[PDB]
Amino acid sequence: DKLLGGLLASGFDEDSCLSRYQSVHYRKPSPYKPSSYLISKLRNYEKLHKRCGPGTESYKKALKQLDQEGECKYVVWISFSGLGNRILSLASVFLYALLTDRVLLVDRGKDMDDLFCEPFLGMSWLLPLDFPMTDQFDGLNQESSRCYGYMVKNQVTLSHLYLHLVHDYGDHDKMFFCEGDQTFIGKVPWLIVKTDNYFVPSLWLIPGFDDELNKLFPQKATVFHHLGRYLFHPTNQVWGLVTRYYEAYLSHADEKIGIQVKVFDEDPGPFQHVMDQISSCTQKEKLLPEVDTLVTPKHKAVLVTSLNAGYAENLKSMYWEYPTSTGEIIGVHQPSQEGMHNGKALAEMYLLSLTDNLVTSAWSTFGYVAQGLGGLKPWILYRPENRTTPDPSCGRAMSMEPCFHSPPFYDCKAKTGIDTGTLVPHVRHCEDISWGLKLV
Numbered sequence: 428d429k430l431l432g433g434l435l436a437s438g439f440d441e442d443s444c445l446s447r448y449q450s451v452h453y454r455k456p457s458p459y460k461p462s463s464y465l466i467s468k469l470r471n472y473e474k475l476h477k478r479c480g481p482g483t484e485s486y487k488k489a490l491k492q493l494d495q496e497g498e499c500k501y502v503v504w505i506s507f508s509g510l511g512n513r514i515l516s517l518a519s520v521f522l523y524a525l526l527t528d529r530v531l532l533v534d535r536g537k538d539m540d541d542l543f544c545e546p547f548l549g550m551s552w553l554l555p556l557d558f559p560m561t562d563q564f565d566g567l568n569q570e571s572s573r574c575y576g577y578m579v580k581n582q583v584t585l586s587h588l589y590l591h592l593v594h595d596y597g598d599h600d601k602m603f604f605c606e607g608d609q610t611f612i613g614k615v616p617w618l619i620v621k622t623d624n625y626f627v628p629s630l631w632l633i634p635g636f637d638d639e640l641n642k643l644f645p646q647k648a649t650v651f652h653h654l655g656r657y658l659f660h661p662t663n664q665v666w667g668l669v670t671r672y673y674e675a676y677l678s679h680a681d682e683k684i685g686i687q688v689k690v691f692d693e694d695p696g697p698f699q700h701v702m703d704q705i706s707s708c709t710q711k712e713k714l715l716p717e718v719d720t721l722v723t724p725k726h727k728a729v730l731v732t733s734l735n736a737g738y739a740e741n742l743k744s745m746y747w748e749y750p751t752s753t754g755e756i757i758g759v760h761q762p763s764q765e766g767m768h769n770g771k772a773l774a775e776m777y778l779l780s781l782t783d784n785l786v787t788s789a790w791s792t793f794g795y796v797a798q799g800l801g802g803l804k805p806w807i808l809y810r811p812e813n814r815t816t817p818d819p820s821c822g823r824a825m826s827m828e829p830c831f832h833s834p835p836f837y838d839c840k841a842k843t844g845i846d847t848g849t850l851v852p853h854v855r856h857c858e859d860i861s862w863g864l865k866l867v
């Protein structure tokens with residue numbers, strides 16, 4: 428089913444975004460049926476967006492509200508940070524638009540236009556190029572006059588509010604995640620957000636939001652799985668990088684393994700500890716077979732994405748040099764070694780997402796998107812310390828979701844510090860970065 432259990436709206440033009448509909452030629456159908464309520468929510472959201480979207484008479488009238496202090500309200504995402512982050516933060520702001528009956532508009536920035544097709548049937552998601560406040564986006568931060576957190580800090584009705592939700596955000600910026608301040612913010616027609624985190628899990632802890640979030644997602648850990656596949660379709664340019672790598676190197680395997688390598692160090696390596704970690708991970712989980720020194724089969728292909736190439740070479744040369752214990756036929760394959768960039772990094776994510784089993788590196792938003800769109804619950808390569816291969820080398824994700832790296836820890840009722848990862852069974856601390864949070 429090319430509309431994804433009904434997640435996607437039929438009627439888009441096939442040739443201008445090939446990936447949208449002919450993705451089902453390349454991926455096994457997802458196990459995760461999106462609920463009836465999520466569906467309606469999206470179909471209803473596209474009526475809002477057509478009704479209030481850029482270029483309508485309702486969008487023109489609303490723009491004058493930026494001076495003279497309103498049926499359409501808006502959240503504006505600003506393009507900021509690495510591609511992994513911008514995908515996760517953008518799905519976040521879109522869930523948030525859903526919860527607050529707003530229109531999402533997207534600062535195209537340098538490249539968003541080039542990377543992604545239009546996800547909303549009948550009408551562009553892109554912020555116009557003449558939107559008056561675009562010159563301020565670089566500068567908007569924690570100390571800007573209309574920053575919600577600067578205002579709560581310094582006790583201060585508004586046409587527009589800036590919401591600073593970047594990882595270095597403070598105690599007052601974080602009040603965004605409270606019911607009280609949401610009631611306030613609820614009234615403001617224009618919201619400009621800049622953000623580099625997957626902030627979805629803290630929305631489940633806001634009351635009101637949590638009812639609707641339960642109704643939309645009966646299987647709670649499907650938020651980015653459905654919202655990602657809804658929103659983000661690669662352009663023809665990027666899609667062809669996907670199809671041509673998949674076609675040339677991966678379509679003849681009985682099984683595909685993905686291995687997403689990120690190493691957090693200012694030396695590119697490669698590192699023996701990390702190679703060691705990857706083989707122990709893959710072997711100890713029966714993901715890839717062992718090899719024998721002193722000596723009707725299946726073909727596995729291993730897709731290795733990384734910046735240094737010698738993680739893939741090592742595996743490639745091991746499996747060329749030595750026969751597998753099981754007699755399985757292994758081929759290792761790395762697209763790029765970057766040391767058309769973001770078109771590439773994008774394709775590689777989507778490629779990772781077509782594998783049957785994925786290994787991810789701890790902390791990488793690159794992993795989270797790949798597992799995210801795959802509907803894949805990874806085995807996570809844990810974060811090293813002192814150039815030592817951790818032991819155990821990896822473990823299975825509690826679930827497929829991305830991880831909220833910089834969450835708030837406030838009890839809004841009681842007005843005090845709290846561990847927000849020990850309030851409800853579905854919001855747990857992360858496996859990879861224990862400080863962060865995620866839906867399980």
Ligand SMILES: Nc1nc2c(ncn2[C@@H]2O[C@H](COP(=O)(O)OP(=O)(O)O)[C@@H](O)[C@H]2O)c(=O)[nH]1
Pocket residue numbers: 509510511688689732733734763765768771772773775791792793
């Ligand atoms: N093509 C490709 N790009 C990558 C890979 N890993 C990371 N990148 C990109 O390189 C840039 C820096 O990556 P990363 O270190 O993961 O992000 P940071 O930690 O937020 O700087 C980002 O724009 C990523 O999209 C990869 O395996 N392949």
